[PDB]
Subunit: 113 residues, 3 copies
Amino acid sequence: SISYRKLDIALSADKETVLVFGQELSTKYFTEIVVTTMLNSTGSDMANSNRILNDIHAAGLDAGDYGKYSRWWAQSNAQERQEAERRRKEAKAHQERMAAIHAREEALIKRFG
Amino acid sequence: SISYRKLDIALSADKETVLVFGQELSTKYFTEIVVTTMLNSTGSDMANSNRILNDIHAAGLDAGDYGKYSRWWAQSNAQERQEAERRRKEAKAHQERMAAIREEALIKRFG
Amino acid sequence: SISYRKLDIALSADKETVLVFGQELSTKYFTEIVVTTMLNSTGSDMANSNRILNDIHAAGLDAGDYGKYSRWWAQSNAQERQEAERRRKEAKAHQERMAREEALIKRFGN
Ligand SMILES: [Mg+2]
């Protein structure tokens, strides 16, 4: 499969959305639809799926939620996984410093009941 | 392929958007790009593609628009398809009760 | 793989977003995530990936950024590539004719 560039993913302070390459998406749409489809489209290209999941982990998302791709990633290159873990800890620290600061529905209700 | 969770899809009253796992998308973008890519990414994993298409059907969308995947799905387990049909009829009733009750700034951006 | 319909893609005047089947997306999200995933999902079905990349090219986007799919496409049917090129030039002429973004900071800090 062809690889993705390093995934530009930021998780929102309330965790409800992500910012992916300048596009804001609901977190659950990204993790349940987008990432699953990216991984499935890699087929058996474990190097590519490992890259994707390292970026998922680095962004603070759950890289273990993707079946065989997750099991491959979890028993994959320890040093690249560790670089992802360093990035993840930096992300969590950013979330902590962001947690140091002090009507969508109605709209959706009118459109979807 | 790895499976999707049960697809959380709601069709808007005017049918122009869908709400998928909390994300609003144009219906045409979802059905022409997103669903097509999900199904293609299953390869020949018919259990997964039948799951996807049962959720598409249950949401009130057209599960017949996806070539070989739709042909497989149409011949698939009748009871699982019927459970999807029950959900589809409930969604249609919800649309009926809702039918009982801009800006197109796109021009400036896209011409 | 199953085919896509002709891709309805318009590039914004500032090039920062695209309008794809009525959905506005950041251009980089569309080209880095969506298109890459569509192409990967075709596997080795070059007829389908060539159709995708002709529509990408026709919209004013870079059809050369997708590895093997781009390499296959660049040597594919010259007349179909040229029809895409005509659409691309018409799109560029369209771009030529003329007359609190964060906001994300409060949400993402960056
Ligand atoms: Mg998408």
